[PDB]
Amino acid sequence: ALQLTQSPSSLSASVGDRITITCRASQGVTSALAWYRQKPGSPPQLLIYDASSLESGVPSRFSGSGSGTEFTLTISTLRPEDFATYYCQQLHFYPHTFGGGTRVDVRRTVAAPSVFIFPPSDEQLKSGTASVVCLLNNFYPREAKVQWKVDNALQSGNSQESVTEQDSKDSTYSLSSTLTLSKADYEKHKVYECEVTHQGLSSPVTKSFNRGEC
Amino acid sequence: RITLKESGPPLVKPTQTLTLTCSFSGFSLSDFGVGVGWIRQPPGKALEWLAIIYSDDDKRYSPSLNTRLTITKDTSKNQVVLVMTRVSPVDTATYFCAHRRGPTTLFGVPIARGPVNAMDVWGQGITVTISSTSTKGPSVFPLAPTAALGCLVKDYFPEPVTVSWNSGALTSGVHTFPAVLQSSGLYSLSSVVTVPSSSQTYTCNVNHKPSNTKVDKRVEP
Amino acid sequence: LELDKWASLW
Question: Residue B66, class by beta-carbon neighbours within 10 Å (0-12 exposed, 13-18 middle, 19+ buried)?
Fold first, then answer.
């Protein structure tokens, strides 16, 4: 159908800056664009309607622009509460398409993740399942990639991830990745590795253990 | 002041029918061109437009969900209902209902389209979870090797689970992660803590009130 | 694609 694309997708910024998010349509939607600000655990709030009209109650710092296919939201002076996810909605054609979001976090110095790998407890194996956990501690920026390999074999489709919300004091993120195997399969292999790629790391750090070194 | 509030079952099973209600105040569904739309949001994802109904009983649905969605209105009771038939775990999300303005009308006839181009007021949202799953307690496993340690709060249903360390004493360096819904329909969560590689006992106090399962797991190298 | 109820008013 339509396709309404947001860029950045993610952006780092400090209190005071000025930022501009871009929503782009495949078809012309005239002036039918809306802008929302979403604080976690809260519903979207209206900022700009009809591409450029400020909504009653919304601070002057916000501004909308564009027409047809090219749209932008311009926050002039970033404020605390403005650290959130932003969506743009198209209301010209049915279905009323939404943008994929543009998360806005607090900017700080690059923080390399302190990596830790945890083997499955011997009291879990007794129940038939093995969960190998990898922790990528207090890092920045949010983008990180964990790769699980078992005896140099790439594990795909058997792991689940989770990320904390940007820390109030640190301005960092932490991620936990869980490789889940069967006791039977767990014990068929020796080297379990958690390969972590990030920007604060010049090269992919690898934390491993041998189920076979005792 | 316009306010909308979503209500319905927080737990539905697959192949069943989900019925959500949007109760409002501050406007009427008889005011020219007003609309009440539904938008959902899968946990940690984007907003997804579902449907909309207007003052004139004119309705539209998301083309993907066309087959299952049915939207109605009772102008007198100030309510709008959304019926999603044959739900699956993919329909697990937070469902919002929002108000759409009519055009700027002078003499009851529209003179400006402007104001309609946004969903101006939304409700708090209602979290709806779909699972074939029965209520049950978590198994707590340790995560023993600054130094790092933690608890793997595994195989529970439904959410939530509270995790504290050393009965509340330890909070610095603690990271309690968001739960992940596993393939088995059960949740899994992990709580960790970074500490000086010097030390002093570490216990995760796990509570899953739905199954009434309270656990204290001591962790060490 | 079909269009908004108001895609056509000024």
Answer: exposed
